[PDB]
Structure 1
Amino acid sequence: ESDLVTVGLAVDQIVGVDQRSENFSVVGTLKLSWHDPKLGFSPDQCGCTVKSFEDASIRAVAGEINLPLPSFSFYNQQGNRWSQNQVIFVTPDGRASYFERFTVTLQAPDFDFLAYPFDRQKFSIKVDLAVPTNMFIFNEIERFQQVVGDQLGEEEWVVTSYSQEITEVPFERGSTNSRFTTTLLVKRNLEYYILRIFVPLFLIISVSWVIFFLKDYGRQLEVASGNLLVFVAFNFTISGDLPRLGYLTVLDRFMIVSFCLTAIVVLISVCQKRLGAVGKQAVAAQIDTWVLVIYPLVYSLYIIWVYLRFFTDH
């Protein structure tokens, strides 16, 4: 009669998603529990309510007790898995427990970013038992604590839904072993994005918009050129926040459109300066009044069009 083991898991943050690296990490907890009568012992010999061991994997205590124990290993791990606060509890009846904080580097496919704020992604963590079916079997999942695992603020990713389930996969020379896979769906956590990149662009565009109120023109033109230089420098300072890809991300569409518009502003300023100096100073005011109300309209139209094209059907 194979013994039955209950298992739970929880994730506190997921860090380091790189297109080139094709791998990531995860930090969380893990809990194992089962009952085997062979572990039982008389309290008279020990003289203690319970017995415990610290700072050792299941493999080591299994080797030292000379009894089989439910070892495991993550399916796709790379290098080594760090473990702190490892402990294992033994009760006189014969129950057991095991708690471990962990951090694993896992292997991942190549993602398809395209839409940058959207970035709906799937993450999966697989846990496998290193003993055949007859020795031990996963029975039921303990949905303890919060798989969301909110601690403070936010991290590089946020959770939106998840689901754990268990299966059986083939083992060596016949037989099988239990598997326990958790699947996650995540979102880019756009708070940092809106608060760091979009607001400075809004201000830098708005200043170039407002310089049109002037009645002189030379100062207007000088300010326009200076602001275009500042816009180029700002576009640079983002730098490594737009990973080197082949195709276009919506951020890139916005950057290109804003840059073209600012260059148009400087061209219009030169033309207005000449028109004013020639003598037809009346029509310059008309052109100013046209542009003042043309710009916000076109920006709204472009935002709406991009929304329709990239966030719904058709």
Structure 2
Amino acid sequence: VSPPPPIADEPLTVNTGIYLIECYSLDDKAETFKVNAFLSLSWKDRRLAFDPVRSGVRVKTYEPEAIWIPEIRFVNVENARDADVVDISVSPDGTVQYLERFSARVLSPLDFRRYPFDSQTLHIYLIVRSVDTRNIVLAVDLEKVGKNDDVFLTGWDIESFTAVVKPANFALEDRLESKLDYQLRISRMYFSYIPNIILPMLFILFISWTAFWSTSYEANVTLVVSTLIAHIAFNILVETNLPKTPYMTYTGAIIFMIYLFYFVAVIEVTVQHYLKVESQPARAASITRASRIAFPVVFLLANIILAFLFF
């Protein structure tokens, strides 16, 4: 069960290929996704070569135990992949054609800074560690790389499954390692975003601005504070549908700015009343009348600035 010796002083290329059968369970929080696929490997072990005339067979089938197979692993997997050998076939030249069906919870990092308009690149990193007797490098057989059309990620759009053909060969713990990058590109499709999240949140915010057409401090306090409780309650409602990140996101910025417009509104309401009370009613009414065009315009600009900064 030794590796195949070299003809000359060359490494062994193992011709890889992942075919996605069923991609599912993307955990935006944990930055994981479970995948169920085919892994196809191919190398040349001349020890296993045969004359198809004497053998009377075109292709000899082997058990994993019977022949030498390279130790292929995944870099960013949670635990060991649940792989099951489908077929091992040796052509007369000694070309081994290996196939296995596996399933693994992959760990690719996610970027929600542009949420819900963010797009991702999910990584599946294939490694192989060079042995003492001979060095091993990974190749990409593009014919054996693809994805099933049924493969779905609800709320996403599966764009492309490609692979960086060039391996990232490097040194590790005194041995050569050959790494390959398999990239799954998914772009978000949150259709019900503006009616589920933005629209009711803008309604609750606009309700507060009716305090610029009112003069009752008691009515204005109710308007601005009560809508503020409504805003918070609504955020607890859409808490589920929102990115729980240590960094500021696009949607997250909008929401923040909204809490600020509640604060500024309160200040107005308080000032209008203080001026009214301090017998400066002309200034009081001037402000409430200005706020009527000021608050909507400033909101619109600040939101245009935001969108520009994130995109």
TM-score w.r.t. length of structure 2: 0.64
Q: 1:96, CA displacement in angstroms?
A: 2.8
CA contact (8 A) 2:78 2:107 kept: yes
Distance 2:42 2:135 in 1: 14
Q: Does residue 33 in structure 1 map to residue 42 in structure 2?
A: yes
Deviates more, 1:274-283 or 1:294-303: 274-283
Distance 1:307 1:106, change over 3 A: closer
Q: Choose between structure 1 and 2: higher helix proportion.
A: 1
Q: Does residue 15 in structure 1 map to residue 31 in structure 2?
A: no
Q: Does residue 125 in structure 1 map to residue 124 in structure 2?
A: yes
Q: 1:244, CA displacement in angstroms?
A: 6.3
Partner of 1:189: 188
Structure 1 segment 213-224 matched on structure 2, within 5 A: 219=219, 221-224=221-224
Q: Secondary structure at the match of 1:33?
A: strand
Q: 1:302, CA displacement in angstroms?
A: 0.7
Partner of 2:234: 234
CA contact (8 A) 2:108 2:122 kept: no
Between the aligned residues of both structures, percent identity stands at: 18
CA contact (8 A) 2:217 2:269 kept: yes
Distance 1:171 1:254 in 2: 45
Q: 1:271, CA displacement in angstroms?
A: 5.9
- Output one character per residue of 1:19-40: Cα deviation in whole Å (capped at 9) or x when no partner: xx7x745525222235656276
Structure 1 segment 250-269 matched on structure 2, within 5 A: 250-269=250-269
Q: 1:68, CA displacement in angstroms?
A: 1.6
- Output one character per residue of 1:112-157: Cα deviation in whole Å (capped at 9) or x when no partner: x694538787654332235648586544432555469773354679
Distance 1:283 1:69, change over 3 A: closer
Distance 1:98 1:155, change over 3 A: farther
Size of the alignment, in residue pairs? 291
Deviates more, 1:145-154 or 1:202-211: 145-154
Q: 1:229, CA displacement in angstroms?
A: 1.2
Gap regions ≥5 residues in structure 2: 1-6
- Give the CA RMSD over aligned residues: 5.1
Distance 2:141 2:212 in 1: 65
Partner of 1:90: 89
Partner of 2:304: 304
Which residue identity is paired with 2:64?
Answer: A
Q: 1:298, CA displacement in angstroms?
A: 0.4
CA contact (8 A) 2:140 2:165 kept: no
Distance 2:304 2:148 in 1: 33
Distance 1:164 1:224, change over 3 A: same
Distance 1:98 1:129 in 2: 16
CA contact (8 A) 1:81 1:105 kept: no
Which residue identity is paired with 1:296?
Answer: P
Partner of 1:56: none
Gap regions ≥5 residues in structure 1: 54-60
CA contact (8 A) 1:28 1:102 kept: yes
- Output one character per residue of 1:194-222: Cα deviation in whole Å (capped at 9) or x when no partner: 44433332232233335655798755653
Distance 1:164 1:262, change over 3 A: same
Distance 1:5 1:185, change over 3 A: closer
Q: Secondary structure at the match of 2:64?
A: helix
Q: 1:224, CA displacement in angstroms?
A: 3.4
Distance 1:155 1:44 in 2: 57
Which residue identity is paired with 1:294?
Answer: A
Distance 2:249 2:172 in 1: 44
Which residue identity is paired with 1:103?
Answer: A
Distance 1:139 1:283 in 2: 76
Q: 1:5, CA displacement in angstroms?
A: 4.0
Distance 1:271 1:127, change over 3 A: closer
Structure 1 segment 91-170 matched on structure 2, within 5 A: 93=92, 96-106=97-107, 115-117=113-115, 124-129=123-128, 132=131, 134=134, 138-144=138-144, 146=146, 151-152=151-152, 154=154, 163-170=164-171
Q: 1:182, CA displacement in angstroms?
A: 0.8
Q: Secondary structure at the match of 1:90?
A: strand
Partner of 2:15: 6
TM-score w.r.t. length of structure 1: 0.64
CA contact (8 A) 1:6 1:33 kept: yes
Q: 1:297, CA displacement in angstroms?
A: 0.7
Q: Secondary structure at the match of 1:126?
A: strand
Q: Secondary structure at the match of 1:79?
A: coil
